Design an enzyme around this catalytic site. Sequence first.
Site, PDB file in Angstrom:
ATOM      1  N   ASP A 152       0.867  -1.209   0.000  1.00 52.22           N
ATOM      2  CA  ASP A 152       0.000   0.000   0.000  1.00 52.22           C
ATOM      3  C   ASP A 152       0.876   1.221   0.000  1.00 52.22           C
ATOM      4  O   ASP A 152       1.600   1.470   0.953  1.00 52.22           O
ATOM      5  CB  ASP A 152      -0.978  -0.023   1.181  1.00 52.22           C
ATOM      6  N   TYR A 199       2.818   9.778   0.029  1.00 53.23           N
ATOM      7  CA  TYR A 199       3.800   9.187   0.900  1.00 53.23           C
ATOM      8  C   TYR A 199       5.201   9.521   0.402  1.00 53.23           C
ATOM      9  O   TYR A 199       6.145   9.336   1.162  1.00 53.23           O
ATOM     10  CB  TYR A 199       3.592   7.649   0.961  1.00 53.23           C
ATOM     11  N   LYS A 259      -2.652   5.905  -4.750  1.00 51.47           N
ATOM     12  CA  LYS A 259      -3.813   6.707  -4.458  1.00 51.47           C
ATOM     13  C   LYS A 259      -3.688   8.085  -5.066  1.00 51.47           C
ATOM     14  O   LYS A 259      -2.609   8.724  -5.021  1.00 51.47           O
ATOM     15  CB  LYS A 259      -3.970   6.894  -2.936  1.00 51.47           C
TER      16      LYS A 259
HETATM   17  N1  LIG Z   1      -5.959   5.759   3.139  1.00 50.91           N
HETATM   18  C1  LIG Z   1      -5.483   6.640   4.117  1.00 50.91           C
HETATM   19  O1  LIG Z   1      -5.958   7.777   4.268  1.00 50.91           O
HETATM   20  C2  LIG Z   1      -4.474   6.081   5.025  1.00 50.91           C
HETATM   21  C3  LIG Z   1      -4.244   6.687   6.280  1.00 50.91           C
HETATM   22  C4  LIG Z   1      -3.307   6.151   7.127  1.00 50.91           C
HETATM   23  C5  LIG Z   1      -2.598   5.014   6.735  1.00 50.91           C
HETATM   24  N2  LIG Z   1      -2.826   4.472   5.528  1.00 50.91           N
HETATM   25  C6  LIG Z   1      -2.079   3.249   5.084  1.00 50.91           C
HETATM   26  O2  LIG Z   1      -2.146   2.195   6.092  1.00 50.91           O
HETATM   27  C7  LIG Z   1      -0.839   1.834   6.526  1.00 50.91           C
HETATM   28  C8  LIG Z   1      -0.849   1.421   8.016  1.00 50.91           C
HETATM   29  O3  LIG Z   1      -1.449   2.372   8.892  1.00 50.91           O
HETATM   30  P1  LIG Z   1      -0.514   3.228   9.877  1.00 50.91           P
HETATM   31  O4  LIG Z   1       0.634   3.651   9.113  1.00 50.91           O
HETATM   32  O5  LIG Z   1      -1.433   4.258  10.496  1.00 50.91           O
HETATM   33  O6  LIG Z   1       0.079   2.226  10.926  1.00 50.91           O
HETATM   34  P2  LIG Z   1      -0.391   0.883  11.661  1.00 50.91           P
HETATM   35  O7  LIG Z   1      -0.434  -0.262  10.704  1.00 50.91           O
HETATM   36  O8  LIG Z   1      -1.551   1.256  12.491  1.00 50.91           O
HETATM   37  O9  LIG Z   1       0.839   0.617  12.628  1.00 50.91           O
HETATM   38  C9  LIG Z   1       1.131   1.659  13.605  1.00 50.91           C
HETATM   39  C10 LIG Z   1       2.441   1.247  14.302  1.00 50.91           C
HETATM   40  O10 LIG Z   1       2.359  -0.113  14.768  1.00 50.91           O
HETATM   41  C11 LIG Z   1       3.749  -0.562  14.917  1.00 50.91           C
HETATM   42  N3  LIG Z   1       3.788  -2.013  14.808  1.00 50.91           N
HETATM   43  C12 LIG Z   1       3.690  -2.752  13.643  1.00 50.91           C
HETATM   44  N4  LIG Z   1       3.747  -4.030  13.884  1.00 50.91           N
HETATM   45  C13 LIG Z   1       3.849  -4.162  15.248  1.00 50.91           C
HETATM   46  C14 LIG Z   1       3.937  -5.262  16.068  1.00 50.91           C
HETATM   47  N5  LIG Z   1       3.904  -6.512  15.488  1.00 50.91           N
HETATM   48  N6  LIG Z   1       4.098  -5.056  17.426  1.00 50.91           N
HETATM   49  C15 LIG Z   1       4.099  -3.802  17.852  1.00 50.91           C
HETATM   50  N7  LIG Z   1       4.002  -2.665  17.158  1.00 50.91           N
HETATM   51  C16 LIG Z   1       3.909  -2.915  15.832  1.00 50.91           C
HETATM   52  C17 LIG Z   1       4.542   0.181  13.826  1.00 50.91           C
HETATM   53  O11 LIG Z   1       5.780   0.690  14.399  1.00 50.91           O
HETATM   54  P3  LIG Z   1       7.147   0.025  13.771  1.00 50.91           P
HETATM   55  O12 LIG Z   1       7.290   0.550  12.379  1.00 50.91           O
HETATM   56  O13 LIG Z   1       8.158   0.687  14.736  1.00 50.91           O
HETATM   57  O14 LIG Z   1       7.084  -1.431  13.944  1.00 50.91           O
HETATM   58  C18 LIG Z   1       3.627   1.277  13.319  1.00 50.91           C
HETATM   59  O15 LIG Z   1       4.265   2.547  13.341  1.00 50.91           O
HETATM   60  C19 LIG Z   1      -0.036   3.104   6.261  1.00 50.91           C
HETATM   61  O16 LIG Z   1       1.357   2.750   6.253  1.00 50.91           O
HETATM   62  C20 LIG Z   1      -0.559   3.470   4.918  1.00 50.91           C
HETATM   63  O17 LIG Z   1       0.012   2.556   3.944  1.00 50.91           O
HETATM   64  C21 LIG Z   1      -3.716   4.965   4.700  1.00 50.91           C
HETATM   65  O1  LIG Z   2      -3.509  12.247   4.945  1.00 50.88           O
HETATM   66  C1  LIG Z   2      -3.603  11.019   4.855  1.00 50.88           C
HETATM   67  N1  LIG Z   2      -4.825  10.525   4.483  1.00 50.88           N
HETATM   68  C2  LIG Z   2      -5.924  11.379   4.048  1.00 50.88           C
HETATM   69  C3  LIG Z   2      -7.050  11.374   5.044  1.00 50.88           C
HETATM   70  C4  LIG Z   2      -6.887  10.980   6.350  1.00 50.88           C
HETATM   71  C5  LIG Z   2      -7.978  10.981   7.206  1.00 50.88           C
HETATM   72  C6  LIG Z   2      -9.218  11.382   6.775  1.00 50.88           C
HETATM   73 CL1  LIG Z   2     -10.552  11.420   7.895  1.00 50.88          CL
HETATM   74  C7  LIG Z   2      -9.398  11.781   5.466  1.00 50.88           C
HETATM   75  C8  LIG Z   2      -8.307  11.758   4.634  1.00 50.88           C
HETATM   76  C9  LIG Z   2      -2.674   9.919   5.091  1.00 50.88           C
HETATM   77  N2  LIG Z   2      -2.918   8.812   4.392  1.00 50.88           N
HETATM   78  N3  LIG Z   2      -2.021   7.887   4.716  1.00 50.88           N
HETATM   79  C10 LIG Z   2      -1.168   8.349   5.658  1.00 50.88           C
HETATM   80  N4  LIG Z   2      -0.167   7.501   6.220  1.00 50.88           N
HETATM   81  O2  LIG Z   2       0.480   7.866   7.225  1.00 50.88           O
HETATM   82  O3  LIG Z   2      -0.164   6.348   5.818  1.00 50.88           O
HETATM   83  C11 LIG Z   2      -1.558   9.638   5.926  1.00 50.88           C
HETATM   84 CL2  LIG Z   2      -0.820  10.655   7.061  1.00 50.88          CL
END
Ligand SMILES: NC(=O)c1ccc[n+]([C@@H]2O[C@H](COP(=O)([O-])OP(=O)(O)OC[C@H]3O[C@@H](n4cnc5c(N)ncnc54)[C@H](OP(=O)(O)O)[C@@H]3O)[C@@H](O)[C@H]2O)c1
Ligand SMILES: O=C(NCc1ccc(Cl)cc1)c1n[nH]c([N+](=O)[O-])c1Cl
Length: 315
Positions: free
Chosen positions: A45, A50, A79
């Site tokens: 993803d 990013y 995206k």
């Molecule tokens: N569509 C959007 O708007 C949107 C928004 C946010 C995120 N995303 C996507 O979703 C992905 C994941 O979400 P997120 O980045 O918010 O993080 P997440 O998957 O919620 O993980 C948060 C933290 O958990 C830790 N972690 C991972 N595996 C672990 C484990 N096995 N034990 C303990 N801690 C652990 C990581 O730290 P370490 O790296 O130190 O392990 C990471 O910083 C993003 O990277 C991005 O690709 C999309």
């Molecule tokens: O701005 C971001 N998303 C747009 C967004 C996030 C929340 C809401 Cl409600 C609406 C739109 C973002 N997406 N991925 C990561 N990331 O950390 O993986 C980040 Cl930050």
Amino acid sequence: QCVKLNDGHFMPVLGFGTYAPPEVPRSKALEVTKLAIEAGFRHIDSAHLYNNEEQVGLAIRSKIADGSVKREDIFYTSKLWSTFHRPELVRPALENSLKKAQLDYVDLYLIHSPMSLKPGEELSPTDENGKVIFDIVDLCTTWEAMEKCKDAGLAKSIGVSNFNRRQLEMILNKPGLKYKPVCNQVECHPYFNRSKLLDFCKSKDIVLVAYSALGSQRDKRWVDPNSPVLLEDPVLCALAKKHKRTPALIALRYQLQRGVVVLAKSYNEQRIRQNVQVFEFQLTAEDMKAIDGLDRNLHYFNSDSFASHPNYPYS
Ligand SMILES: NC(=O)c1ccc[n+]([C@@H]2O[C@H](COP(=O)([O-])OP(=O)(O)OC[C@H]3O[C@@H](n4cnc5c(N)ncnc54)[C@H](OP(=O)(O)O)[C@@H]3O)[C@@H](O)[C@H]2O)c1
Ligand SMILES: O=C(NCc1ccc(Cl)cc1)c1n[nH]c([N+](=O)[O-])c1Cl
């Protein structure tokens, strides 16, 4: 392990999250993406936002060139950023992402957010109060542009991200709709389990893809440090001890058992490998009920930057 999407393509049910904040060196995304493929991740993803698509794409191509996987084995997502919602900008933004990654196609291209932003050079055009400068765009016309991208072969599948049910509904009831979104990628974890949205997606053959499934990276740009830390939750911790897993693995497994595809970001070699253990154990029905009790409507993304935007989904 894959789910069949509504367009007939297939999505691996565990995905690797590639985002790391700017203080992380760009080169790390390359290293950790290779590590994630070695460990068994097949769904990767990324996004224009990013600033890592070159590194993520290279990691993927390296794992193809050294013979580890075939392109057809990898499911790569990017995206469309919110400054590019105007229909004429959608295909060029996708072409930009393909050139960054050096890929002929993306397996999935999403509208990253329903909150359209003033077009221009800035990723986050700001108003002086620090509120993002909004744009008024009919997202139905942005969706018609996405559909053209699928028709040209630039993306195998198309979907949305951060849409609420009513926003999804608007796309679904569009006159002359050609392709439904395959998925809606949204914040989803035991503190915000989106069960009403999940039920709506399931009724529409739309996959819910959970991000910040482990409780987010807790970035002070958008996240209140007083918020409960998901992986310190006592119920998840109690369940981790019960199964001799970890609270992350508990949080990932919960999603799979509700029919949610789940992302997990880690830049740590050990946790990356740990996270594939999600396939190695099962939660019971009472375990799932206990985790359902944690819901508290808590979105970690919670900034004045966007909460006043006309298309904020959490309104
Ligand atoms: N569509 C959007 O708007 C949107 C928004 C946010 C995120 N995303 C996507 O979703 C992905 C994941 O979400 P997120 O980045 O918010 O993080 P997440 O998957 O919620 O993980 C948060 C933290 O958990 C830790 N972690 C991972 N595996 C672990 C484990 N096995 N034990 C303990 N801690 C652990 C990581 O730290 P370490 O790296 O130190 O392990 C990471 O910083 C993003 O990277 C991005 O690709 C999309
Ligand atoms: O701005 C971001 N998303 C747009 C967004 C996030 C929340 C809401 Cl409600 C609406 C739109 C973002 N997406 N991925 C990561 N990331 O950390 O993986 C980040 Cl930050």
